Amino acid sequence: ATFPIMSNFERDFVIQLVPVDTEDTMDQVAEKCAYHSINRRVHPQPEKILRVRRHEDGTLFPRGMIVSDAGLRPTETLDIIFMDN
């Protein structure tokens, strides 16, 4: 259920290693990433929604998809991005 990914947080300067769960939705992936980026080096944007995107090819996952269903390679890099929605 523990599964490593690489977080490329929007407006941060550096990709980081973030352990997620295979059961986590995208929204819970996004929350676990932000913890290493919001209020350390990126400013909260509370009129915004954190969406999860595959780095390599730009595929946008729905907020609600869980990691198990995402078809990810261990350690796959993910854009964490600011959207409305």
Binding site: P4, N8, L17, H36, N39, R40, R41, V42, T77
Partner: protein, 491 residues
């Protein structure tokens, strides 16, 4: 009376012969010599442009040591070190740990050429090479050793390269690829031409001016003595390149140059860039790291490369652009991960400093500046804990440096990933990925620190564990060089 050097010099390198009791390939194994199907006869056109013979060497070099070692004894009671700018001290601690043992290692890289080159002229030069880095490594141990009693961090001048601390691994990963694990002709191109001629020679000049500008004589004299040794051995890749070009091999030679320059540059962007632009105090800043690169390194490369009959590397334009970026990334990573290095990094983002940064780099405050905005707010607000990390950065699988890049309103951080035989690799840049691709067998099963972490090799598998694994403890672990003094500017 005495002969003139030019009258007998040639006889010192009229040392090739045709083996009989063993074969040419036995005596010069391709994997050590890299003669590349070019004949012993053709390797003999090799002509070093700077010549020296044994008695000249032991005599001029006895004088260089006498000088350097006397300057050091004369300034020792004065303790310049106890009252230097703490960003300067840090610059010294970083230089000694990253380089002393790699200097020493370069004597083997010189020995490789000395035994296995087919150019008689290269073998003798490399003998002097081998002597030079014997000196560099020993004098760079003897100097910092003055300071052991002042801080354990000075023990790192000896220990660093014996540890798995991430910076030490980025150092070995460079050095070993360039000079320890290549054939002779390769070492001559990739080390003496690309790294030494390309980068060291100038770097050491700038570094010596900075020691002086900081009031550090001892160090200015040490660096600038070592620097006068450089080109005697650095010149060795030049004639090798002519020979490869004039026989079938412009592309083999190109490809080696391309790889060595990128690899060099990446090392230089973490080891030198941060220092110039953030550690040396504002009023001493003579030019920016980008300025310094353009004037003293980059144009020398195009000049050299044009004279050799070679091309600018395909990655040149990108490389130009990155002078605006990478070292700002590496500085921010080092500062942010500061308890993972053995020196105290300097934040260098006081208001005056940020103004300077902004004129050297239009766009800085809008990009790089935000992250530092947040770090600063936190510090002003008594939340220092959000300015140290809780995870690992992603490490590039070629340079072993974090994959970092432009933040803020020009967000542009990219990962040049590659799947290869069922493993996912990460690359900090397009060029870093291509170094792996043109020669995957050379790098496959290497594992970077993150890889090791993920794999189970670091136990306990948490940050305190990674600290122990990197051999870091309180007392060595990096912290803010001025102890957060630049923070009072904001309250």
């Amino acid at each position: 009376s005495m002969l003139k050097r030019e009258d007998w010099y040639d006889l010192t390198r009229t040392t090739n012969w045709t083996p009989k009791y063993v074969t040419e390939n036995e005596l010069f194994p391709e994997e050590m010599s890299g003669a590349r199907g070019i004949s012993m006869e053709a390797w003999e056109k090799y002509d070093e442009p700077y010549k020296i013979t044994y008695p000249e060497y032991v005599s001029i070099q006895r004088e260089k040591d006498s000088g350097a070692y006397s300057i050091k004894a004369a300034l020792e009671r004065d303790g310049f070190v106890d009252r230097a700018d703490p960003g300067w001290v840090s610059t010294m601690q970083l230089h000694f740990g990253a380089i002393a043992l790699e200097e020493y290692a370069a004597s083997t890289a010189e020995a490789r050429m000395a035994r296995f080159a087919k150019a008689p002229g290269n073998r003798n030069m490399a003998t002097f090479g081998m002597m030079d880095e014997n000196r560099h490594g020993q004098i760079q141990l003897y100097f910092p050793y003055a300071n052991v009693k002042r801080s354990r961090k000075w023990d790192w001048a000896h220990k660093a390269i014996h540890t798995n601390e991430w910076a030490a691994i980025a150092a070995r990963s460079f050095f070993d690829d360039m000079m320890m694990t290549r054939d002779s002709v390769a070492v001559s191109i990739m080390l003496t031409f690309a790294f030494e001629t390309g980068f060291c020679n100038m770097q050491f000049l700038g570094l010596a001016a900075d020691a002086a500008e900081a009031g550090d004589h001892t160090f200015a004299s040490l660096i600038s003595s070592i620097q006068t040794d450089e080109s005697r051995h650095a010149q060795q890749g030049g004639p090798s390149l002519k020979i490869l070009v004039e026989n079938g091999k412009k592309d083999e030679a190109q490809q080696m140059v391309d790889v060595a320059i990128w690899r060099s540059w990446k090392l230089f962007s973490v080891l030198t860039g941060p220092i110039m632009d953030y550690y040396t105090p504002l009023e001493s800043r003579n030019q920016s790291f980008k300025e310094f690169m353009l004037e003293w390194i980059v144009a020398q490369f195009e000049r050299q490369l044009l004279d050799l009959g070679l091309d600018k590397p395909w990655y040149w334009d990108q490389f130009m652009q990155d002078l605006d970026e990478t070292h700002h990334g590496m500085h921010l990573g080092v500062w942010y991960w500061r308890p993972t290095v053995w020196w105290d990094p300097a934040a260098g983002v006081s208001p005056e400093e940020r103004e300077w940064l902004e004129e050297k780099y239009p766009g800085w405050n809008d990009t790089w500046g935000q992250c530092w905005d947040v770090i600063t707010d936190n510090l002003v607000n008594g939340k220092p804990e959000l300015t140290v990390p809780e995870t690992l950065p992603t490490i590039c699988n070629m340079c072993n440096l974090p994959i970092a890049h432009t933040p803020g309103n020009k967000w542009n951080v990219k990962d040049y990933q590659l799947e290869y035989e069922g493993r996912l690799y990460h690359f900090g840049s397009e060029a870093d990925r291509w170094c792996f691709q043109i020669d995957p067998e050379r790098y496959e099963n290497h594992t970077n620190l993150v890889d090791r972490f993920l794999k189970g090799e670091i136990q306990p598998a948490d940050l305190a564990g990674a600290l122990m694994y990197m051999s870091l403890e309180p007392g060595v672990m990096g912290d803010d060089a001025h102890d957060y003094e630049w923070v009072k500017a904001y309250q």
